[PDB]
Amino acid sequence: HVVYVGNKPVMNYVLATLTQLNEGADEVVIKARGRAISRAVDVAEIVRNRFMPGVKVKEIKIDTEELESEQGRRSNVSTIEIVLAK
Amino acid sequence: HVVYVGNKPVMNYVLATLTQLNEGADEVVIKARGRAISRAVDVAEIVRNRFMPGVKVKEIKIDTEELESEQGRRSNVSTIEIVLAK
Amino acid sequence: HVVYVGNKPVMNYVLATLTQLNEGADEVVIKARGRAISRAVDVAEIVRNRFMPGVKVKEIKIDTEELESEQGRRSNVSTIEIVLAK
Amino acid sequence: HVVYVGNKPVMNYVLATLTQLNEGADEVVIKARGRAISRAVDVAEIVRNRFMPGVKVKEIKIDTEELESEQGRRSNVSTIEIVLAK
């Protein structure tokens, strides 16, 4: 059960996360790369702080990926993975 | 030990991380908050995936921190702590 | 749009309210009857005083509804309708 | 001219409301918090349905208040305010 964090308002992504767990889903994975990683973290704190305390931060994985820009630029962009579980 | 990641050139922070580990540092702690969170990650990847290959991410912590907004209102930001170990 | 508030966990209802407004809902209508009336209110407060600060109570309606008791006798319950607007 | 709705039978509170208006009193305010809010509404429907139709539901205000439990528990409890006027 993944949840990709992008540019949309934080709320969208957090609800999606809540509706995932609320949908049973025992463990959910929050992902994002580039400047979105901050939002990813934001999303995980809002969920664990304002909706489901007791929800646990199982894991946080950071890495690198190659991304091709619309202009043909190829570069390394960081990525994060936060695992939330009841 | 720690390395607070602000808005200076990303390289200063990796520099400081490397330098720290150089002296035979048990483990450097990269910390940051808000939109800076993405650079904390960039700094850890740049450091273990390029300058000091093999460095390990001993641990990663996310948390929320309360602040004094401005007009005296309630405010806060997410934080991240990346623990690098040789 | 509406959200009928029954006996499920209060959070499901706020969840549904939030979710509803999320999609750019003109205005969500929280409805309930009998002892449930108190939760309809809890859901509106929890939603505008915690999860989506600034939401406004466009209107509130109370009314009586006739029912088919059980043994075939005359019966009814009060109802409440809370209109939330972004 | 207030009327606090609590645990006593509905009738007590409705009569009090009637005896208020009957006592001249142009506008009366019915209040209650927690699980009593349903009774408050009940009271307003019984008055407007079985004693004084034409009486009008001027306003309905919902809010939150802090309450200290006998056991020292501090929490937010919803409240309602129904304004009845001839």
UniProtKB/Swiss-Prot annotation, chains A, B, C, D:
Species: Archaeoglobus fulgidus (strain ATCC 49558 / DSM 4304 / JCM 9628 / NBRC 100126 / VC-16)
Quaternary structure and partners: Forms homodimers and homotetramers. Interacts with Alba 1.
GO annotations of cellular component type: chromosome; cytoplasm
This protein's UniProt keywords: Chromosome, Cytoplasm, DNA condensation, DNA-binding
Stored NCBIfam families: DNA-binding protein Alba (TIGR00285), PRK04015.1 (NF003088)
InterPro entries: Alba-like_dom_sf (IPR036882), DNA/RNA-bd_Alba (IPR013795), DNA/RNA-bd_Alba-like (IPR002775)
Function according to Swiss-Prot or TrEMBL: Binds double-stranded DNA tightly but without sequence specificity. Involved in DNA compaction.
UniProt record similarity statement: Belongs to the histone-like Alba family.
Keyword Ligase: no
Result of changing F51R: Less stable tetramers; decreased ability to bind DNA
Compartments, record wording: Cytoplasm; Chromosome
GO molecular function: double-stranded DNA binding; RNA binding
GO biological process terms held by the UniProt record: chromosome condensation
Domain of life per record: Archaea
UniProt cross-references to HAMAP family, sorted A to Z: AlbA
One Pfam family here: Alba
Protein name: DNA/RNA-binding protein Alba 2
Consequence when changing K8 to R/Q/M: Less stable tetramers; decreased ability to bind DNA
